[PDB]
Design an enzyme around this catalytic site. Structure first.
Site, mmCIF file in Angstrom:
data_model
loop_
_atom_site.group_PDB
_atom_site.id
_atom_site.type_symbol
_atom_site.label_atom_id
_atom_site.label_comp_id
_atom_site.label_asym_id
_atom_site.label_seq_id
_atom_site.Cartn_x
_atom_site.Cartn_y
_atom_site.Cartn_z
ATOM 1 N N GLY A 1 1.227 -0.688 -0.606
ATOM 2 C CA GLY A 1 -0.204 0.021 -0.009
ATOM 3 C C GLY A 1 1.199 1.530 -0.160
ATOM 4 N N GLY B 1 0.655 5.172 2.324
ATOM 5 C CA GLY B 1 0.858 4.773 3.230
ATOM 6 C C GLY B 1 0.389 6.827 3.981
ATOM 7 N N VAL C 1 4.685 1.238 0.343
ATOM 8 C CA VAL C 1 5.859 0.688 1.019
ATOM 9 C C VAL C 1 5.000 -0.815 -0.275
ATOM 10 C CG1 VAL C 1 5.204 -1.187 3.026
ATOM 11 C CG2 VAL C 1 4.254 1.434 2.998
ATOM 12 N N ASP D 1 -3.456 8.970 13.802
ATOM 13 C CA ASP D 1 -4.288 7.945 11.945
ATOM 14 C C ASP D 1 -4.556 6.933 13.208
ATOM 15 O OD1 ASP D 1 -5.383 8.478 9.593
ATOM 16 O OD2 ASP D 1 -3.217 7.642 9.116
#
Ligand code: QTN
Ligand code: AMP
Ligand code: AMP
Lengths: 451, 181, 300
Positions: free
Chosen positions: A16, A18, A23, A132
């Protein structure tokens, strides 16, 4: 060769993207050991001027060693990019797990929540707020253990300082965050945890609307539905974590004391529990050992992780922790109790011929620009120098004529009510004098000369 | 030992990397969803390179160029010692930002709605009672946010009373000053 | 295993003893001294460091002993005001007080050992030692014998117990057993203050006609004259001056000569008092065992 290699790790597909960085999965060229590699572009960090933010994020992850926070193994630096080699977890997002299942069974929900809170507490104790926290940022290992990740939105909790950065998912954002108000930090992470708990138990969000203004209003309102299958115990916990008023909101201490949270709680998760010291490293004690002796942090950790019990470094480390436990368990000797046999030195009250109240800074009913013009004319009269941060925030300085040192303070004008204002005084950072005395004397002379 | 990233974002079907390091041979790059990349081990110093995209020599705009006696235009890279350790790289990087900050001082000149007060600042440590059983100098643990901030008592007699909570290592001291005015 | 507490004292910094969160009251030396004693009462504190604004340094401490000295020196009658208590600044009272002899600021660094703290308390015959950070110049905490002994009791389980801990008060000879400054039930407050000034003791056992302890007049109890604003009548008995605490007074904390050092230490730490009155079978005062005697013995 064809493959893309950094260290001894061959880079694969994107896991994914971020908040900041991409990543990818990495696989060890000899053993097949898997890692998650976060790539950060040097030029992007320069152009966004976030070099310090990244430096601190890296310093923080290098320091953190919690069983429920993704571990940073190494960072490989190159002329254009930084590669952060991290612990890989195969279970994926807690988000997808809640979607796969309907909602999570009470026992497993409690257990995952206890692990998430443990990780959040550890951050706060190290003066870091995640900001987050959401099921998408909570990862699961092969044994269904939770791991918090993505410190991209995180920040340092600084003494006398407030955070404003309105950041994260709206569904998980605290009323004060969506309102663009100044907040402390920890209470904001507590609200997000309240939302995650509701999601584990119900399989739905407590505040949700396709029309964002309605959602914001629903959050600010704090009205949410507690289903009937949820017991009165967990419902009170939810209600306390999802309090609109941050001062009435549950703290980690409040949660740890809650009957529903205490149930089946493993003893290694919080610092005052029996197994914490045996499993979670104390960074402060590692530093004390490096000082008392003359070694590396790694030399200290190696004697703990794989050394002999009689090892000089491990002995020194455990003695600090043993002594710290003695002190921590005499809590009434180090901190004041909340309002028995009175203390022998309890003074009788002062007889008249009324309990006086302390107040923050100085208040004024005058117009903002008229208050500021009065601070400027009083400062020049006192021969104080300044720097304008903004219209309502000044950095002011004065030289102590006795000690020769400069004295610095920050002035912030704030809105209290309808045409009621407050001017806040904050110290910055003398050997020969006293830093605290210098702050009070600078304050006293400005308050005195103010109209 | 010394990894150097060669990344092409400009798109294409096939991308090759040529440079001083491979005697201007065509090194085929692998693609992700968009990026074509190669990570090579390069010693410190200057390195000349160029991309070959779909039968054509292509200039990299993200890097400086160099022109030879015979008019060959190549991209140029600098591999520095500071590039191979994060904190050295981050120190160099911040210095470039500070250098940029200069291009874009205490004084006594005044400036040409104020923010809402955080409710945390109104939790006054000296207004709350502590319970008779404990040592009267003891206080509860402060919230980090109220440290360094000034609290006062209204002027009574000719005396000004001020206080603030300050940190010393991991302990907190709430000092009160009785100062005549 | 005798040096076990001396080694402990030498291994621990003063920092370890400082509360996680505490209150410190400072007075600028130009402050009216009556305002200073009232500020001690209002803030519920016994002692305050003294800040000299003109010098830009801490120059001493204001304690209850300062109040005992002003009252004894200047009180004339209940019919007349104590003008100097109403008029003097800290600055001017100190010029008068320290006119005959020299006495600079006695302080300790947070990084100095507990051994150094105990040494400075005894050597300088003081009860309050300010912990001043050399780096920032800030006073952080006011260290006492009570604080040190309680910190030592927390760690007595962490080490072998020396043989003297199980030895009686008689065998060890810790304390004062001769020329004990005491007061009668009828003793005027002024007389008791004279005894504090002359004998430099921290408390006076209050005895009946037969010589038995009934109450204790500590220097701490003198601050009640400032709290209740009853300082202009020092003719009043020591009993009338102690009446304010009769509804919560559990009695006089005492010990016997046959009792062990460990028992006495445990009793003192739990009670949070500076001394015990050593008595016989029938409550007749035989001596005093103070925290200063105990720490002197332990860290010798
Ligand atoms: C598909 S297979 C068969 O498995 N083979 C396979 C093929 C290619 C790769 C691959 C490996 C590394 C990169 C890479 N990408 C970067 N992007 C970047 O910067 C960008 C700008 O900022 C953004 C963004 O990133 C950080 C953010 O902050 N720097 C980078 C460096 C590198 Cl090395 C690209 C592709 C891996 C595997
Ligand atoms: N009322 C008293 N009469 C005589 N000696 C005392 C009395 N109170 C304390 N002492 C002794 O005086 C010294 C100082 O004690 P203190 O003022 O209690 O710290 C110690 O050696 C005590 O034993
Ligand atoms: N041995 C004792 N027995 C009973 N009360 C005491 C004793 N020693 C001190 N106190 C009281 O404890 C308070 C604090 O006194 P001090 O121990 O001198 O710090 C005062 O109100 C004293 O009267």
């Amino acid at each position: 060769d064809g493959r893309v290699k950094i260290g001894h790790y061959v880079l694969g597909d994107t896991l994914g993207v971020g908040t900041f960085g991409k990543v990818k999965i990495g696989e060890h060229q000899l053993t097949g050991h898997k890692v998650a590699v976060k790539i950060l572009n040097r030029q992007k960090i320069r152009s966004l001027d976030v070099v310090g933010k990244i430096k601190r994020e890296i310093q923080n992850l290098k320091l953190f060693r919690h069983p429920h926070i993704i571990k940073l193994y190494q960072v490989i630096s190159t002329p254009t990019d930084f590669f952060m080699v991290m612990e890989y977890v195969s279970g994926g997002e807690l988000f997808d797990y809640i979607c796969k299942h309907g909602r999570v069974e009470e026992m497993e929900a409690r257990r995952l929540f206890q692990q998430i809170l443990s990780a959040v507490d550890y951050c706060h104790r190290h003066m870091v707020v995640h900001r987050d926290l959401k099921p998408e940022n909570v990862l699961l290992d092969a044994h269904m253990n939770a791991k918090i990740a993505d410190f991209g939105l995180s920040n340092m909790m600084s003494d006398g300082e407030f955070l404003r950065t309105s950041c994260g998912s709206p569904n998980y954002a605290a009323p004060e965050v969506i309102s663009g108000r100044l907040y402390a930090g920890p209470e904001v992470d507590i609200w997000s945890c309240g939302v995650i708990l509701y999601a584990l138990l119900c399989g739905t969000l407590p505040f949700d609307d396709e029309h964002v203004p309605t959602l914001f209003k629903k959050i600010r309102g704090g009205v949410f539905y507690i289903p009937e299958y949820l017991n009165r115990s967990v419902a009170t916990l939810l209600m306390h974590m999802l309090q609109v008023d941050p001062l009435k909101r549950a703290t980690i201490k409040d949660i740890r004391e809650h009957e529903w949270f205490k149930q089946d709680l493993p003893s290694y998760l919080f610092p005052e529990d029996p197994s914490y010291d045996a499993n979670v490293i104390d960074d402060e004690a590692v530093k004390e050992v490096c000082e008392k002796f003359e070694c590396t942090e790694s030399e200290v950790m190696n004697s703990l992780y794989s050394g002999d019990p009689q090892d000089q470094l491990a002995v020194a480390y455990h003695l600090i922790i043993d002594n710290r436990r003695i002190m921590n368990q005499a809590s009434e000797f180090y901190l004041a109790s909340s309002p028995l046999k009175p203390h022998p030195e309890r003074m009788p009250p002062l007889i008249a011929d009324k309990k006086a109240k302390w107040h923050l800074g100085i208040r004024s009913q005058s117009k903002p620009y008229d208050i500021m013009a009065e601070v400027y004319r009083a400062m020049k009269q006192l021969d104080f120098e300044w720097k304008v941060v903004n219209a309502y925030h000044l950095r002011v300085r004065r030289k102590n004529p006795v000690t020769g040192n400069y004295v610095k303070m920050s002035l912030q004008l704030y809105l209290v009510d309808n045409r009621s204002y407050l001017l806040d005084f904050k110290s910055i950072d003398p050997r020969l004098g006293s830093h605290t005395m210098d702050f009070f004397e600078m304050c006293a002379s400005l308050i005195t000369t103010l109209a | 030992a010394r990894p150097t990233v060669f990344r092409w974002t400009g798109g294409g079907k096939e991308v090759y990397l040529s440079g001083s390091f491979n005697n201007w041979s065509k090194l085929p790059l692998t693609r992700s969803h968009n990026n074509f990349v190669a990570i090579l081990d390069l010693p410190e110093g200057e390195h000349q390179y160029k991309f070959f995209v779909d039968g054509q020599w292509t200039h990299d705009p993200s890097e400086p160029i160099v022109t030879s006696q015979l008019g060959t235009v190549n991209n140029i890279i600098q591999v520095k010692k500071t590039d191979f350790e994060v904190f050295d790289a981050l120190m160099v990087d911040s210095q470039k930002c500070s250098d940029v900050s200069e291009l874009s001082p205490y004084h006594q000149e005044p400036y040409v709605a104020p923010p809402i007060l955080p409710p945390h600042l109104l939790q006054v440590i000296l207004n709350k009672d502590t319970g008779i059983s404990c040592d009267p100098a003891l206080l509860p643990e402060p919230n980090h946010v109220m440290l360094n901030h000034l609290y006062a008592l209204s002027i009574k007699d000719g005396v000004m009373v001020l206080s603030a909570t300050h940190r010393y290592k991991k302990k907190y001291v709430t000092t009160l000053l009785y100062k005549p005015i | 295993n005798n040096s076990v507490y001396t080694s402990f004292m030498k291994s621990h910094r003063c920092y370890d003893l400082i509360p996680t969160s505490s209150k410190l009251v400072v007075f600028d030396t130009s402050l009216q001294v009556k305002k200073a004693f009232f500020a001690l009462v209002t803030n519920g504190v016994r002692a305050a460091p003294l800040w000299d604004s003109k010098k830009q340094s801490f120059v001493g401490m204001l304690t209850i002993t300062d109040f005992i000295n002003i009252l004894h020196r200047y009180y004339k009658s209940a019919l007349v005001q104590i003008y100097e208590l109403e008029e003097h600044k800290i600055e001017t009272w100190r010029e008068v007080y320290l006119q005959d002899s020299f006495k600079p600021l006695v302080c300790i660094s947070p990084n100095a050992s507990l051994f150094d703290a105990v040494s400075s308390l005894i050597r300088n015959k003081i009860h309050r030692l300010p912990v001043i950070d050399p780096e920032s110049g800030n006073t952080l905490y006011i260290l006492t014998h009570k604080r040190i002994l309680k910190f030592l009791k927390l760690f007595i389980t962490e080490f072998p117990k020396p043989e003297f801990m199980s030895k009686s008060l008689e065998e060890l000879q810790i304390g004062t057993y001769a020329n004990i400054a005491m007061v009668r039930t009828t003793t005027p407050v002024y007389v008791a203050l004279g005894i504090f000034v002359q004998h430099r003791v921290s408390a006076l056992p209050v005895v009946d006609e037969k010589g038995r302890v009934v109450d204790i007049y500590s220097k701490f109890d003198v601050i009640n004259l400032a709290a209740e604003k009853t300082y202009n009548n020092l003719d009043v008995s020591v009993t009338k001056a102690l009446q304010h605490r009769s509804h919560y007074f559990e009695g006089v904390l005492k010990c016997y000569l046959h009792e062990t050092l460990e028992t006495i230490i445990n009793r003192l730490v739990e009670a949070e008092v500076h001394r015990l009155v050593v008595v016989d079978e029938n409550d007749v005062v035989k001596g005093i065992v103070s925290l200063s005697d105990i720490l002197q013995a332990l860290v010798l």
